[PDB]
Amino acid sequence: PITKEEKQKVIQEFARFPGDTGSTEVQVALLTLRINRLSEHLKVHKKDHHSHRGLLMMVGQRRRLLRYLQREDPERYRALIEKLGIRG
């Protein structure tokens, strides 16, 4: 859950563009946070069959991100995956 300084934390961590508030980094960050949140949501929501309803779209955009993120900046590939925590 974000807050005033949590926003500042997310922005100082991820977004570093002329508009570091709605930058790709923060949006993929929120896309990944949404996936995680929704997965823990679905682990409670047993009433929601056809699960991963809109999570498949995000998983798809996350795997599509490969030839986009890495291509428009080689550092952003490896460093946004570092930021998100895809390194493990």
Map tokens 């490896």 to a residue. Answer: 78
Map tokens 């997965």 to a residue. Answer: 39
What is the distance between the alpha carbons of residues 62 and 1, in angstroms, rounded to a whole number? Answer: 22
Q: What is the per-residue DSSP string for 30-43?
A: HHHHHHHHHHHHHT
What is the distance between the alpha carbons of residues 36 and 56, in angstroms, rounded to a whole number? Answer: 12
- In 3D space, the residue among 17, 41, 11 whose CA is nearest the CA of residue 29 turns out to be 11
Q: Domain 1-88: what homologous superfamily?
A: S15/NS1, RNA-binding (1.10.287.10)
End-to-end CA distance of the chain: 22
User: Tell me, what DSSP letter sits at residue 22?
Assistant: S
